């Protein structure tokens, strides 16, 4: 009975991880803007996207869009955060305008305390990414779950 719950928990984690795979493996080489009060390839800071702790935001290249149909792949902005101890995906469907747009916030994984991301430059894992011209060779997304603790997943970035 509790075992059904723990089996479901592992399924929940996989739904989250596969969603993260579809973003972090398909990182687009395009600079996005944070329209508050600048402009980067990978955005990474405290309270970004109104996260309770760390927040990440970057451009994503989508190919199998069910709604729209561009063969070459639509570029859209995506992001991750923690809110009320849930890992949440944030998605921007349309381009950036001074009007602003309705973001799509989707909770992926429950009972997640902390989000942490480390970047591999080529020889060493670092805590920030100031380079706005080129992506890091690899990205390690670490999720701190209340039950399982720290789980990390590494992603190789395509170069350009």
């Amino acid at each position: 009975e509790l075992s059904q719950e723990r089996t479901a928990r592992l399924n929940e984690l996989q739904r989250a991880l596969v969603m993260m795979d579809s973003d972090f493996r398909q990182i687009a080489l395009r600079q996005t803007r944070t329209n508050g009060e600048s402009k980067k390839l990978l955005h990474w800071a405290d309270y970004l996207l109104d996260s309770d702790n760390k927040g990440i935001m970057f451009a994503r290249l989508g190919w199998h869009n069910p709604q729209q149909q561009f063969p070459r792949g639509e570029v859209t902005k995506v992001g991750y955060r923690i809110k009320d101890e849930r890992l949440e995906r944030v998605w921007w469907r349309y381009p950036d305008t001074p009007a602003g747009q309705e973001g799509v916030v989707t909770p992926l994984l429950s009972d997640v305390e902390e989000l942490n991301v480390r970047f591999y430059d080529g020889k060493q894992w670092i805590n920030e990414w100031s380079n706005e011209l080129t992506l890091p060779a690899a990205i390690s997304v670490e999720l701190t779950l209340k039950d399982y603790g720290k789980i990390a997943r590494t992603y190789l970035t395509p170069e350009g």
Partner: nanobody
Amino acid sequence: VQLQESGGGLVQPGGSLRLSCAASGFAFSGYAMSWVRQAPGKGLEWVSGINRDGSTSYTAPVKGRFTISRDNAKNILYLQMNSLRPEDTAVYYCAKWLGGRDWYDRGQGTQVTVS
């Protein structure tokens, strides 16, 4: 419903009005909140926003004229509108704020009118 607005209606140009937003069903105090409007003949446009710590932000065409505030005790977001111009006539929505000018979980809204 999580966000319900109140205090709309008609006012003479140059008049004042205070929109209210009843928050419920989530940890209001820990969220950044915003106001968004839709004027006739235009899409939805971000008006103002208030951070969890209290810091505020405004669009140029409303700065120093509209004032956003929040009451964490009663879970209510306010928008004090002063010197109301005809151009402000729009459907004002209350929403959660992502930073920048982007919003989500938009409320049903209230009609504010003037000409």
